[PDB]
Every structure is written in C-alpha cells, then in structure tokens.
Design a protein around this ligand. Sequence first.
Ligand code: HEM
Ligand code: HEM
Ligand code: CYN
Ligand code: CYN
Lengths: 191, 191
Amino acid sequence: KIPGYTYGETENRAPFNLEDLKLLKEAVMFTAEDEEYIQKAGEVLEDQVEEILDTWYGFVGSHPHLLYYFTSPDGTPNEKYLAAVRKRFSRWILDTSNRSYDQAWLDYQYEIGLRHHRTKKNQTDNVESVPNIGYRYAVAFIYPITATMKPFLARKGHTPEEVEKMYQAWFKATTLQVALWSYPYVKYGDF
Amino acid sequence: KIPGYTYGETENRAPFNLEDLKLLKEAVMFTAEDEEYIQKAGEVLEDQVEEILDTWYGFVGSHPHLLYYFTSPDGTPNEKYLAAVRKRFSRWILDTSNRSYDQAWLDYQYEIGLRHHRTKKNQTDNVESVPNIGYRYAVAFIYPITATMKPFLARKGHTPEEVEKMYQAWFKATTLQVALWSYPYVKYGDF
Ligand code: HEM
Ligand code: HEM
Ligand SMILES: [C-]#N
Ligand SMILES: [C-]#N
C-alpha cells in the first residue's frame, strides 16, 4: 500500500458533481481527444517518474518560500513528510493519466484540495508543519507542473506534433484539478 | 478613453505587495527572459486584437454556462455589457505586455479580481447581471486564454523558438494574474 493514499475510499463525497465536472471540462477545452492523449502521456512518463520527481521537488526546494510548506517549525524541511508525499505525488502522475475522471476521481480531487488546505494539511502523515498552503501558490503551480512534464514527454521519440497534444492534455488536466481544489479555499457560495 | 478602465486610479491599494509579487513570479518561473518575451508578444498581438477578441468571446459565447456571466436576469445576453468589457479586455492584452509589474499594476490586478467577484461585478458598466463569477471558471480559463493566443503569436514570422518563448511568457503571466485575482474569493487568511 502507499501510506495515506485513499483513492476510492475517502471520508466525504465531493461537493461538486459530475455535471459540474462536465461544465468545467468544457471551460478547459478538455474532450475525449484529451482522454486519449493524457493516457498516451502516462505511457511516456511512467518509467521516467523518478527523474520527474527529482525535477519537481528540486523546483520546490529551490525557493525557500515554496520549500516552506514542507518545513518543521524550525524552518528545516521535514524529510519524513517530503518522502511520504513524494510517493503520493508519483501515484498522482499515473492517476491523472489512467483513471477515468468519474465520481471516485472527483472524490479524491476534493481530498487532495483538503490536504493542501488547512482543513487536512499535515494530518495524513501526522507531521508538525505549516498549517495552510496559500491558494496563490496552488494556482501558480499549474505553470511549473507543465514546464516540468514538457521535456519528459519528448523523451520517447514522439514527434513535436504528438508531444504538443500530450503536453496540452496535461496542461488542461492540471488546470482542471487546481480549479476543483479551490473549493475548500473559496468563501462558501463563491466557487 | 475606455469606459470603466481605471488603471492607476483604483479606490483601493492591493492587499498584496511587491515582495508578494516577487515570490509569486518565482512560483510561475517568471524571469527577465519572460519580460523580454512578453513585450515581444505585445508587439506581435497588438494589431491582431480584433481577431483575438472575436476568437475569445466566440469561445465564451459558444457555451451557455459561460456566456451566462454576461446575461441579463431574464437569461438573455447583455450585448452592451459584452461590448464594454471587450474594450477593457483588449486593453488588458496590451497592459500584460507593456506595463511595468509594479504597485500600480498590482492595484489594478486586485481591481480586476474584485470585478469578476461579487464585490464589484456589474458596477463598472452599471449593468444588471449575474452577481458572481464562480472562481472555478477563473482558474479554468487560464487554459483557453493561452490556447486562444497561441496561433496569433506565430503570425508575424518569428522563429519557432521565439513563438514558444512568447507563448510560455503569456502562460506564466496569465497564471500569475489569476493567482492574484483569487484574493477576494479566498477565505480570509488562506490566500
Ligand atoms: C498544480 C498544483 C499542485 C499539484 C499538481 C500538486 C500535487 C500534489 C499531490 C498529487 C499531492 C499528494 C496528494 C495525496 O495526498 O494523494 C500533494 C501534496 C502536497 N503538496 Fe502539492 N500540488 C500542487 C500545489 C502545491 C503547492 C503550491 C505546494 C507548495 C509547496 C505544494 C506542496 C504540497 C504539500 C506540503 C503536500 C502535502 C499536504 C498534506 O499535508 O497532505 N503543493 N500535492
Ligand atoms: C484567465 C481568466 C480570465 C481573464 C484573463 C479575464 C480577463 C478579463 C479582463 C481583462 C476583464 C476586464 C477588466 C477591467 O475591468 O479592466 C474582464 C472582465 C470580465 N470577465 Fe473576465 N477574465 C477571466 C475569467 C473570466 C471568467 C471565468 C468569466 C466567465 C465568463 C469572465 C467574464 C467576465 C465578465 C462578465 C467581466 C466583467 C466583470 C464586471 O462586471 O466588471 N472572465 N475579464
Ligand atoms: C505538491 N507537490
Ligand atoms: C473575460 N473575458
């Protein structure tokens, strides 16, 4: 088992529903074509995850105000926390590529939002760290997620045109998720 | 000369400052290289704005749940509201590329967020319309903004390298802005 990974068995049903998801997919221009290309992206990325993780957490570690969110009270990174979260992030790369975006998927999107937010941050791994990840950075991180995945999507010999379809699908899917994760951050009724 | 366009003359100072901005630029991987290329993007886009606007508002207009946010209470689109906003969106394309990202800029970023939010929506143009734009869609729209801009960035004969750099700069800058606009939506203390 991956500790903390509770896909399909969360405590709560998401407050947003499949019709909400349909309308949000429309807003990010995500279609069945992107379902196909995000699956292809998974096939490309899967055996590269260790490098992807080093690249991603190397970016987070590169700026003290970002690494901050994994820190103990003494301002140093909590290595237990980083390591446990890293295994769930690795799984999220696969889930984004391989799951159907169905009710179980939506329920886990609510869960991941809750875990970045003060509602559930630091509970999954039972760590002492900062209480909330400022929403400004959740939105910001759509960009570095896509810039991180880009070079890996080209490393299996796909043409620029195919890489572009995978990259755009990943961009749409990442934006879609962060949009959903806003729920616990946003004043009730404003989401 | 643009009705409702009050850049430099907002009633409020922004609740985020230049240090917040520096740290958020770092979160979207924005550097002096992007300053060069966002300015080049403006030079490329400036004389294409009518077609860009037709494309963008064509996208909004093609989805009833998005066009919704410009409708009168009787459910029908308010074309005056659309037209007035269109003029300020046109200017935003130039501002994104030409303004220093400084205090005045931050003040107007807070203003734009307030205008999508119930705080100020429908006041600028003195219209009667939907009270609030749900934040889920503001995040989602990062994607179709970038997808709208992309083809136009190639239309002045720049090299593929330069077009990609302009596109990435636009994506960083759009993400940066939507992150800032979240302020009035986000539970107090969670931004
Ligand atoms: C596009 C935005 C982001 C994506 C795609 C992303 C992805 C993920 C994933 C997949 C997980 C594990 C979820 C699970 O428990 O199964 C996670 C957890 C976490 N992320 Fe992010 N994340 C984003 C934004 C942020 C930001 C802005 C930070 C700031 C450094 C950050 C820091 C963390 C931390 C500290 C956790 C553990 C939260 C907890 O205590 O449960 N993430 N993230
Ligand atoms: C990336 C996200 C978005 C961008 C870049 C964007 C851009 C803009 C700009 C530049 C303006 C005029 C600002 C001014 O007053 O100077 C504006 C206003 C407006 N936008 Fe957006 N927008 C975004 C999201 C949305 C969404 C999700 C909707 C839903 C259709 C929308 C609908 C409108 C409406 C109705 C107004 C007028 C608000 C008011 O009454 O003042 N926008 N937008
Ligand atoms: C989040 N990593
Ligand atoms: C907003 N358009």
